Design an enzyme around this catalytic site. Structure first.
Site, PDB file in Angstrom:
ATOM      1  N   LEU A 174       0.843  -1.181   0.125  1.00  0.00           N
ATOM      2  CA  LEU A 174      -0.059   0.069   0.026  1.00  0.00           C
ATOM      3  C   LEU A 174       0.809   1.256  -0.029  1.00  0.00           C
ATOM      4  O   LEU A 174       2.135   1.282   0.450  1.00  0.00           O
ATOM      5  CB  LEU A 174      -0.978  -0.031   1.257  1.00  0.00           C
ATOM      6  N   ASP A 175      -0.042   2.500  -0.373  1.00  0.00           N
ATOM      7  CA  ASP A 175       0.933   3.589  -0.568  1.00  0.00           C
ATOM      8  C   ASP A 175       1.257   4.627   0.812  1.00  0.00           C
ATOM      9  O   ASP A 175       0.645   4.125   1.718  1.00  0.00           O
ATOM     10  CB  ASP A 175       0.290   4.377  -1.731  1.00  0.00           C
ATOM     11  N   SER A 176       2.065   5.345   0.586  1.00  0.00           N
ATOM     12  CA  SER A 176       2.041   6.417   1.557  1.00  0.00           C
ATOM     13  C   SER A 176       0.899   7.075   2.077  1.00  0.00           C
ATOM     14  O   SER A 176       0.760   7.292   3.373  1.00  0.00           O
ATOM     15  CB  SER A 176       3.012   7.460   1.266  1.00  0.00           C
ATOM     16  N   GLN A 200      -0.995   4.481   4.329  1.00  0.00           N
ATOM     17  CA  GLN A 200      -0.360   4.549   5.483  1.00  0.00           C
ATOM     18  C   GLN A 200      -0.533   5.810   6.384  1.00  0.00           C
ATOM     19  O   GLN A 200      -0.611   5.258   7.569  1.00  0.00           O
ATOM     20  CB  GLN A 200       1.402   4.616   4.883  1.00  0.00           C
TER      21      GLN A 200
END
Ligand SMILES: CCCCCCCCCCCCCC(=O)SCCNC(=O)CCNC(=O)[C@@H](O)C(C)(C)COP(=O)(O)O
Lengths: 171, 157, 606, 459, 128, 60, 87, 176
Positions: G41-43, G46
């Site tokens: 998953l991406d920042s 996150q």
């Protein structure tokens, strides 16, 4: 105790409540229990302390002074007349302030005892209060801090000379 | 102890040595040292800072002095006694400042003008004065026991 | 009666043992909260008796003793007076504070500083009693500044928290503006009536009285959170919960209007004065009602509500009706003491998080507290007819049947509507929403002290308004003769407020993400008064302290006028007299010119 | 009165011929004995003063100030150790004997009869204070402090001598009764204006008034605790005592010529309460507080009401106790940290949890908490000045508000919110400083119960 | 959609809408790097002279000492009497004094003349 | 010798002593004088405290 | 207002609110797992997770840390530092 | 204004904007469902031009985003009751006593709590035992003539404690 002549009291007025209820009357039960459970031991202790103080007798005398004459019978500088004169005047000044205190205490007692009808049966005491305070305002007021006796006599002379000129012009 | 040359006489001039000495002394960037300047108001040679600085300095940095946002070595803006939080809070406002003052003055002025419009125009439910029984309730006002009777009556209507 | 004076003086003296006790103890008592609670309960049961004797017959009496500095034509003793207000307010305040003693037994279970806390709270009660009883006005001023400084200490209980002592500084400053108003009133009473005592003030009614009336107005608007000097009130809500409850339930919040109630023979006449009274009260009521909308901290909401009710009492003093305002004091006291106590129960039930967002649905999280808050907030505006009905609705209908100012009537109209809508909104957002509060729930109210305290105050706030309002001696003529559509209007405004907050709620159910329209912002952001004043008035006086006062005028100019001129004159004259090099021909030429200039020019022999 | 003079002499060779660990008990014990000895004085009644000789007498203005001096000496003597106990024995003996000679000339000054004797004992009051503050001034500008001190007080108090000699050889002798019983009014010739200006201006210097208040702050921030308490309490209220006596003469021109000094005092009272709201150097805030209270004193002296003089003497005694106490607490804090600044030493509600009780009690007396004497003084002065004018109450109340705020800022600045946690050297509170606080604040509350003693001659 | 947030002397300018934070030249990166270096070295010196177990006294910050010496003792040097300094001195020092002086002259002359007429409310005005 | 012999003994010594500036003497003297001036009809607190027979106004 | 926290309990609560999140699986949900390597998953999501922790536990975490948690074990460690989790 | 570097970056600046806008949307929006809808809408609005290879248009859109954010913020952004500005702000600071105290007690109370003070004494001997050499050598050993950073290296060498740790370890427990 005191002198009731100089501290007058209005004649007492007390009714008796007549129920006309059947709960009845809790506060009468409470005040009888209060008298029996509070007023008895303080009475016995006061009897004890009264015997213990009346076993021997003391006295305190009301201090009284004579009348050394006046400032108007004193000479130019000559301090030995002025000293007696001014201490006589200053003791009159203190007793005169306490006379004003007594009149004001009478006025407070008349305000509280006459209730929410203010202007009933205080008007004679209000009248004598305004009379005595007109005298005090005319006599001892605007002299300031360093009154000794001489500014009082200067105010006296200047006031009656102004009134003499006023009645001479009015006539 | 304390060095004599860690005091601070005189303003900025001249530019090489005095600004180098103030950069060495107050622990600042060289071309960010700003004297006030010298209008002769006293003030020594102490720096100008960005002047608000205390609802700034977001509180998650975990510096040393917890209720002052200090870091033991900052040059400490001249008016700091007016800038401890509990004295003056210069937060960036949610709206403006001019918008604030104009709307507050407008609302209070309008409400006081409506108060004056109320003061010239009362309400009353349509009813005459009370029918006081004894000469507008005489002898129980301020005094006058036998001075002057003041005859005024009421009629049944 | 000896019983009457004896029981009143022992209601005074029962609040004297525990302070000197733990000042003399040094062996830490375990049962100290129990001890302070039972001495407040004993003070209550001794105070219930002479009030019942008072309404039973009358016998309306003053005590006065121990005169000190009976100096000039005046005198002053410790003296206090049993008439009606100081007669039968004291049981309400003792009862409220007794329940707060219960709630602060529970709420402050987890601090070893509990003993000093109860010492401060009982000392605050003592000073509030000495305030509300006295007729010697110096003793009133004693009680005034004492309850001010106990308010300071109890707001600044939690040291640390720079917002808290900031807030306590605001509170004590507005107390001192109350002080300047009160000492101006004392100044006029002394220099024109030879004393400062209530009885002689009532005895002689002066004609020109505008200066002491303005002093009393300033004292009330400083003391009781009124407009211009109001915003110390969320400031006062910065502190702990039972401090806040006692601080703005009865004690320290009614003391501003208590004085204006106490001087009702002086504020009989001077229609300019009563106009100032009711116009100022209408301004307070509308501003705090408009500010109370869109708020999310609970204590700020309850404080804005109590400022609105105090504004109603200022209007009640504006009309010549003081005794209904005292009725409102008592009912309001039971009312918001119970409300603050329910709020603090919720807040300490949910880990001291206190905000309405992240509180949403708490109905049936045990419904003793939800029942408590809906009892309180529907007693707000007076669900007809409960204790809250009598005060508020007879006040607004008597204001309607009065020679009013034609704008204050509409202010009470809009204020009743506003207090309805935020009452209903705070019930909806607090209790019957959807539950939005973080997990690991720790909700518990199976607690004897809390159910005793909440039980005791709902039983108080359900009956005591009717019980007190029934057996008053009739101190005014009730109107009772209203036109049509002027008695219905109270229930009309409260019902339309309920419906209006209901439709705002059912628009909150929708989803649009609307925008701020700046009336939202004027309602939410305190509108602009604490921000503007608390960011402009500190900066101006301290701009003038630095430049003008400290660094400019005193130091540098006073040192350059008195020392420096002298020092430079002496230094230059020294360096021009004694700075002469050592030759002889100079000295003899000086001799020669001195001899010539003394003989012929400025002669000495003629 | 020589029954009080001669044991104050004989307390001096005591200190010489006592040894190490032997001077201390002798001086402190015997000075407390002299405190009881002058507690015996208070007999004064009714008609006049009481004459303790052909040379000494006591007005009822002088009795509470004299009792305050002989109360304040042993407190001061215990207060002035731990900052010189590590110095030499001979220098310590010289310090103690300097304080005893100082008290001796203070008793000389308060029990004056003739104004020339009063002037000699005025500057004899001056000269030990100089030597104390210069020898133990403890900071780099005690030089300038003593220099400003002596030149201001002498060069203000210098023509006072000439005016009093002129009064001496125009109106006979200078007994206070023969200054009284013979005083005649003096009209508005300009020589009368300069004579009144000379006397009133010398005591203006000694109060201080506002245009000459920078005499004070260096002379308290760079002084030891004994000389600071001496200077503040006894010297400023001694100057007030002197003006209270010599204002009996020259009443017919003080109305015409008193207008600028009242306005200087009022606007400077406002400015001084403003200037002590923002300064560092916590020791100096009490000094500017003292300038504020003495400005209120000077308002009370130049208005000439008996109400005003009663409020003036009560304000004198209460402010003397408050300033001496609060100087002692500031010395306690400077013994804790070697700073003297305000924003550094913080916290201290946790640590030393009963030192804060004394800070709170002093701060509320400086607030004028209402049963205390300071509110009695300030209240009667406000009453008298409102009878003076229907307008000056703005300045009095604004003084009250700003006084509340700076006194509270002194309270909650240095002793509220967070310890700086790089201090780690402060000791828990000794028995000595707690004893000093207890010697301050028992008599203030005991006079708060029964204050009919301390009111002035116009009781 | 927004009037671009006019600032004031009280309303601080927040970190978002500067808009100088978005014109990042290399000089701003250089200044931020050197400012972080200065803060790093000062925290290093302070933490090494802060965590010493033998260090008894206080850390004795020269910043506070330097600010106090600049604030109080370093005013009177340096100074020159300028037009602005002399003007503001005679304005904020003498103006209010002479103003309050004249208005108390006015009030006192009113009250003296009015009680010289005798028609004042001093029927009882004892506590003077 | 600072509290146990000074403070409580001074508290007793100043709590009561004779009539400082003649207070209760003036109380009872004013009591007796106003009782006399009520019991002999003349008005209480006669104004013009010095005798106008013993006064001499200078003339015009 | 003091419920005792413990390491197993905070581990269970953090893994409960991670498992309740949508676009991860309850199969490959490890304690020692990356928010960059294996969960992929991406920042953005996150920091949505970081927001979930802040909104559950009741305190902000600073952005000097929100760059650099990236795994649930250091999440548990950092709330263990904020709370000082021992009885 | 941050300890790590001289600036945040563009990335974390956009990120803090996203956190603030999402928090303000919490403070704007009750009932949590329309909140979840609007949060996904905001996520899509940032998804519209995430992949700009440009930079100047990205920071210009960042500035215009700050304008539309500051126009659309809330009067009370929902601050948690543990944060500064919030309801607590060191709420129980009444009992956050520093631990340089508790050694200035009378030995009666040091006899009341014996084992704790014995272990505290060996803590202080642990502190002084490794204070001079390792800690001051690791401080005057690694960095440049200017430090230019506010981090500090650990004691990874062999043994004892990382430097400058006493006022970090010995703090109040934040709920006493
Ligand atoms: C309240 C009002 C808020 C609305 C804001 C207005 C909308 C403006 C935008 O769409 S954002 C402006 C610039 N946007 C950017 O994405 C700039 C470049 N950023 C990126 O590429 C990032 O998404 C990154 C670097 C992939 C982040 O990676 P993390 O995830 O690994």
């Amino acid at each position: 105790s005191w002198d009731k002549d100089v501290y007058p009291e209005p004649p007492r007025r007390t009714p008796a409540p007549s129920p006309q209820t059947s709960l009845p009357n809790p506060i009468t039960y409470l005040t009888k229990a209060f008298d029996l459970l509070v007023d008895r031991p303080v009475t016995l202790v006061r009897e004890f302390i009264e015997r213990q103080h009346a076993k021997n007798k003391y006295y305190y005398y009301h201090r009284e002074f004579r009348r050394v004459p006046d400032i108007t019978e004193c000479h130019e500088k000559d301090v030995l007349c002025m000293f007696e004169a001014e201490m006589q005047w200053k003791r009159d000044y203190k007793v005169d302030q306490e006379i004003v205190n007594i009149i004001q205490e009478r006025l407070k007692a008349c305000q509280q005892r006459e209730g929410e009808s203010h202007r009933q049966n205080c008007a004679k005491e209000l009248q004598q209060f305004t009379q005595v305070v007109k005298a005090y305002q005319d006599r001892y007021h605007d002299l300031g801090a360093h009154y000794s006796a001489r500014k009082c006599l200067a105010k006296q002379k200047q006031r009656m000379l102004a009134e003499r000129k006023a009645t001479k012009e009015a006539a | 102890s304390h060095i004599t040359k860690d005091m601070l006489p005189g303003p900025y001039p001249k530019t090489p040595e005095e600004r180098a000495a103030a950069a060495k002394k107050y622990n600042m960037r060289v071309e960010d040292y700003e004297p006030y300047p010298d209008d002769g108001m006293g003030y020594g040679d102490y720096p100008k800072l960005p002047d608000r600085s205390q609802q700034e300095r977001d509180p998650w940095y975990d510096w040393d002095h917890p209720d002052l946002r200090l870091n033991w070595g900052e040059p400490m803006h001249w008016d700091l006694d007016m800038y401890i939080r509990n004295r003056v809070d210069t937060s960036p406002t949610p709206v403006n400042w001019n918008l604030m003052c104009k709307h507050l003055f407008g609302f209070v002025a309008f409400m006081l003008f409506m108060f004056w419009v109320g003061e010239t125009y009362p309400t009353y439910q349509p009813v005459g004065p009370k029918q006081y029984p004894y000469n507008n309730l005489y002898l129980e006002r301020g005094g006058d026991p036998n001075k002057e009777p003041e005859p005024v009556v009421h009629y049944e209507i | 009666m000896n019983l009457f004076s004896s029981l009143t003086l022992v209601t005074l003296i029962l609040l004297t043992m525990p302070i000197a006790a733990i000042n003399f103890n040094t062996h830490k008592f375990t049962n100290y909260p129990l001890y302070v609670k039972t001495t407040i309960s004993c003070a209550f049961i001794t105070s219930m008796i002479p009030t019942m004797m008072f309404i039973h017959t009358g016998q309306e009496m003053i005590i006065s003793n121990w005169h000190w500095l009976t100096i000039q034509t005046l005198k002053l003793s410790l003296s206090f007076k049993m008439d009606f207000f100081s007669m039968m307010f004291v049981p309400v305040a003792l009862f409220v504070t007794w329940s707060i003693m219960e709630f602060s037994m529970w709420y402050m279970h987890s601090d070893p500083n509990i003993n000093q806390f109860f010492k401060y709270l009982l000392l605050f009660l003592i000073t509030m009693l000495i305030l509300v009883t006295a007729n010697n006005l110096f003793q009133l001023f004693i009680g005034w500044e004492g309850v001010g400084i106990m308010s300071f200490l109890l707001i600044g209980w939690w040291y640390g928290r720079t917002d808290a002592n900031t807030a306590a500084l605001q509170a004590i400053l507005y107390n001192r503006i109350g002080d300047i108003g009160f000492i101006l009133a004392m100044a006029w009473f002394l220099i024109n009536l030879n004393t400062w005592d209530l009885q002689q003030i009532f005895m002689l009614n002066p004609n020109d009285s505008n200066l002491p009336l303005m002093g009393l107005i300033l004292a009330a608007t400083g003391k009781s959170a009124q407009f211009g000097l109001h915003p110390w009130l969320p400031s006062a809500m910065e502190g702990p919960t039972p401090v806040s409850a006692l601080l703005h339930s009865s004690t320290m919040v009614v003391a501003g209007i208590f004085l204006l109630i106490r001087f009702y023979p002086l504020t009989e006449n001077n229609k300019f004065g009563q106009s100032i009274m009711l116009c100022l009260g209408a301004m307070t009521t509308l501003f705090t009602a408009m500010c109370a909308l869109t708020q999310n901290d609970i204590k700020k909401i309850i404080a804005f509500s109590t400022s609105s009710q105090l504004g109603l009492m200022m209007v009640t003093i504006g009309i010549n009706q003081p005794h209904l305002a005292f009725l409102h004091i008592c009912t309001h006291a039971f009312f918001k003491a119970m409300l603050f106590m329910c709020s603090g129960s919720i807040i300490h039930s949910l880990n001291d998080e206190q905000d309405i967002r992240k509180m949403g649905g708490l109905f049936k999280a045990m419904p003793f507290t939800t029942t408590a808050l809906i009892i309180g907030s529907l007693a707000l505006t007076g669900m007809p007819f409960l204790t809250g009905f009598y005060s508020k609705d007879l006040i607004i209908e008597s204001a309607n049947t009065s020679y009013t100012n034609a704008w204050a009537l509409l202010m009470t109209l809009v204020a009743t509507s506003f207090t309805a809508i935020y009452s209903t909104r705070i019930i909806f957002f607090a209790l019957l929403g959807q539950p939005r509060f973080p997990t690991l729930i720790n909700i518990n109210e199976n607690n004897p002290f809390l159910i005793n305290s909440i039980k005791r105050l709902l039983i108080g706030s359900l009956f005591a308004g009717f019980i007190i309002s029934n057996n008053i001696p009739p101190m005014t003529i009730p109107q009772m003769t209203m036109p049509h559509y002027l008695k219905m209007t109270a229930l009309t405004v409260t019902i339309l407020g309920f419906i209006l907050a209901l439709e705002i709620s059912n628009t909150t159910h929708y989803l649009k993400f609307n925008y701020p329209s700046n009336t939202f912002k004027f309602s939410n952001l305190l509108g602009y008064y604490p921000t503007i004043m608390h960011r402009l008035t500190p900066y101006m006086n301290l701009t003038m302290s630095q430049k003008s006062a400290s660094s400019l005028l005193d130091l540098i100019w006073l040192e350059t006028i008195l020392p420096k001129t002298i020092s430079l004159a002496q230094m230059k004259m020294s360096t021009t007299i004694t700075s002469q090099k050592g030759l002889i021909k100079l000295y003899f030429l000086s001799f020669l010119i001195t001899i010539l200039i003394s003989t012929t020019l400025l002669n000495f022999h003629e | 009165m020589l029954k009080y003079i001669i044991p104050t002499m004989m307390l001096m060779p005591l200190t010489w011929l006592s040894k190490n660990s032997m001077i201390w008990i002798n001086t402190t014990l015997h000075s407390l004995l002299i405190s009881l000895t002058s507690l015996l004085l208070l007999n004064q009644f009714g008609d006049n003063s009481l004459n303790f000789s052909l040379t000494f007498f006591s007005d009822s203005l002088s009795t509470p100030l004299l009792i305050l001096t002989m109360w304040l000496l042993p407190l001061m003597l215990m207060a002035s150790q731990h900052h010189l106990s590590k110095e030499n024995l001979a220098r310590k003996k010289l310090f103690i004997s300097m304080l005893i000679l100082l008290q001796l000339f203070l008793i000389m000054t308060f029990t004056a009869t003739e104004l020339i004797f009063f002037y000699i004992m005025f500057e004899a009051t001056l000269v030990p204070t100089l030597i104390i503050i210069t020898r133990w001034g403890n900071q780099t500008e005690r030089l300038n402090a003593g220099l400003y001190f002596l030149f201001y007080t002498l060069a203000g108090s210098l023509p006072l001598l000439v005016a009093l000699i002129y009064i001496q050889n125009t109106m006979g002798s200078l007994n206070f009764l023969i200054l009284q019983y013979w005083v005649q009014p003096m009209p508005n010739s300009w020589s009368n204006t300069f004579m009144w200006l000379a006397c009133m201006m010398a005591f203006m210097v000694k109060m201080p008034l506002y245009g000459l208040h920078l005499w004070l702050p260096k002379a308290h921030v760079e002084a030891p605790i004994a000389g600071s308490m001496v200077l503040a309490a006894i010297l400023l209220k001694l100057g007030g005592y002197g003006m209270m006596r010599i204002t009996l003469l020259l009443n017919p021109i003080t109305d015409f010529m008193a207008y600028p000094f009242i306005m200087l005092s009022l606007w400077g009272m406002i400015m001084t309460s403003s200037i002590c709201l923002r300064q560092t150097d916590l020791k100096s805030l009490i000094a500017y507080s003292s300038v504020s209270h003495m400005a209120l004193v000077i308002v009370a002296i130049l208005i000439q009401t008996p109400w005003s003089y009663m409020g003036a003497t009560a304000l004198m005694i209460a402010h003397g106790l408050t300033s001496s106490m609060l100087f002692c607490l500031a010395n306690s804090n400077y013994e804790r940290v070697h700073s003297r600044t305000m924003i550094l030493a913080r916290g201290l509600q946790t640590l030393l949890p009963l030192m804060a009780a004394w800070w709170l009690l002093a701060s509320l007396t400086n607030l004028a908490l209402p049963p205390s004497i300071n509110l009695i003084g300030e209240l009667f002065v406000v009453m008298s000045t409102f009878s003076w004018s229907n307008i000056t109450i703005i300045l009095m109340g604004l003084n009250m508000v700003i006084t509340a705020l700076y006194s509270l800022y002194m309270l909650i600045t240095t002793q509220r919110g967070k310890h700086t946690h790089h201090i780690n050297n402060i000791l828990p509170s000794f028995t000595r400083e707690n004893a000093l606080m207890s010697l301050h604040m028992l008599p203030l509350l005991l006079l708060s119960l029964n204050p009919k003693i301390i009111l002035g001659p116009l009781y | 959609s927004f009037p671009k947030y006019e600032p004031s002397r009280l309303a601080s300018l927040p970190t978002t809408l500067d808009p100088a934070e978005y014109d990042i030249s290399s000089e701003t990166r250089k200044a931020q790097a050197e400012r972080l270096a200065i803060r790093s070295r000062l925290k290093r010196e302070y933490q090494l002279q802060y965590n010493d177990p033998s260090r008894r006294g206080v850390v004795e910050d020269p910043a506070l000492i330097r600010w106090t010496c600049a604030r109080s003792a370093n005013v009177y040097p340096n100074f020159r009497p300028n037009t602005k300094t002399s003007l503001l001195g005679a304005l904020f020092g003498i103006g209010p004094l002479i103003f309050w002086y004249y208005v108390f002259k006015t009030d006192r002359d009113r009250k003296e003349k009015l009680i010289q007429e005798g028609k004042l409310d001093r029927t009882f005005n004892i506590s003077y | 010798f600072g509290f146990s012999i000074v403070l409580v003994l001074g508290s007793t010594f100043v709590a009561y002593l004779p009539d400082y500036r003649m207070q209760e003497w003036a109380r009872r003297e004013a009591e007796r004088l106003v009782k006399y001036r009520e019991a002999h009809g003349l008005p209480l607190m006669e104004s013009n405290c010095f005798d106008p027979s013993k006064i001499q106004l200078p003339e015009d | 207002d003091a419920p005792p926290l413990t390491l197993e309990g905070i581990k269970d609560r953090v893994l409960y609110v991670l498992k309740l999140y949508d676009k991860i699986d309850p199969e490959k949900l490890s304690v020692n797992s990356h928010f960059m390597k294996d969960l992929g998953l991406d920042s953005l999501d996150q920091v949505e997770i970081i927001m979930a922790m802040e909104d559950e536990f009741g305190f902000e975490i600073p952005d000097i840390d929100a760059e650099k948690l990236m795994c649930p074990q250091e999440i548990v460690d950092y709330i263990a530092d904020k709370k000082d989790v021992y009885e | 204004f941050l300890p790590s570097a001289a600036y945040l970056t563009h990335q974390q600046k956009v990120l803090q904007l996203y956190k603030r806008a999402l928090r303000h949307l919490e403070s704007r929006c009750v009932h949590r469902d329309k909140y979840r809808y609007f949060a996904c809408l905001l996520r899509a609005r940032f998804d519209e031009h995430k992949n700009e290879k440009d930079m100047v248009k990205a920071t210009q859109l960042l500035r215009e985003a700050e304008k539309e954010f500051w126009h659309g913020q809330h009067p009370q952004p929902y601050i948690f009751p543990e944060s500064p500005g919030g309801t607590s702000y060191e709420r129980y600071e009444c009992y956050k006593v520093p631990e340089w105290c508790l050694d200035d007690w009378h030995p009666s109370e040091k006899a009341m709590y014996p084992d704790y003070f014995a272990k505290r004494e060996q803590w202080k001997k642990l502190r002084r035992e490794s204070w001079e050499r390792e800690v001051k050598q690791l401080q005057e050993e690694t960095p440049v003539g200017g430090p230019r950073t506010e981090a500090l290296p650990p004691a990874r060498k062999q043994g004892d404690l990382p430097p400058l740790w006493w006022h970090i370890v010995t703090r109040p427990r934040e709920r006493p």
